[PDB]
């Protein structure tokens, strides 16, 4: 996989962000994770965590997996990096997202994320508390 440049347009919620990618505005949905909706428990914390991560970043990168790059809603499916740190993994490590939506073909970082989820659950963090 390769990292490609993008710039933040707007934080949306815990697992979606609006970025400018190849010069077009696009809503990116984070691969392999599920954050609670803003209206559910830890939803506001997940949105806040992602917002901080992307808004503080000096460099945001998008990394597509091997499979489909857009979902049925037209959202980009990607791993997103903020100054080299993966947002998807960070949310999971903090117990603010579950590993989820693991489809054959877009799952290169599954093991990495499940490893994070295990540590988060061990520490009884947030969703696991
Ligand atoms: C993460 C991801 C979600 N999706 C679709 C599945 C779900 O369809 P449904 O909307 O019919 O349930 C939806 C969940 O996204 P959200 O968690 O943002 O609601 O996004 C994909 O198709 N591929 C993916 O990799
Ligand atoms: Ca969600």
Swiss-Prot record:
This is Nuclease A. The active site is at residues 29, 37, 75. Residues 109-129 are annotated as: Disordered. It comes from Staphylococcus aureus. Ca(2+) binds at residues 15, 34-35. Residues 109-125 have a biased composition (Basic and acidic residues). It is found in: Secreted. Coiled coil: none annotated. The gene is nuc. The chain holds residues 89 to 223 of 231 of the full protein. Disulfide bonds: none annotated.
């Amino acid at each position: 996989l390769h990292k490609e440049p993008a710039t933040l347009i707007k934080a949306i919620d815990g697992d979606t962000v609006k970025l400018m990618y190849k010069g077009q505005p696009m809503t990116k949905r984070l691969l392999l994770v599920d954050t609670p909706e803003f209206n559910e428990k830890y939803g506001p914390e997940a949105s806040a965590f992602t917002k901080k991560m992307v808004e503080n970043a000096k460099k945001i990168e998008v990394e597509f997996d091997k499979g489909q790059r857009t979902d049925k809603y037209g959202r980009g499916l990607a791993y997103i990096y903020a100054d080299g740190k993966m947002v998807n993994e960070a949310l999971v490590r903090q117990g603010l997202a579950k590993v989820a939506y693991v489809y054959k073909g877009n799952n290169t970082h599954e093991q990495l994320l499940r490893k994070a989820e295990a540590q988060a659950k061990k520490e009884k963090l947030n969703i696991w508390s």
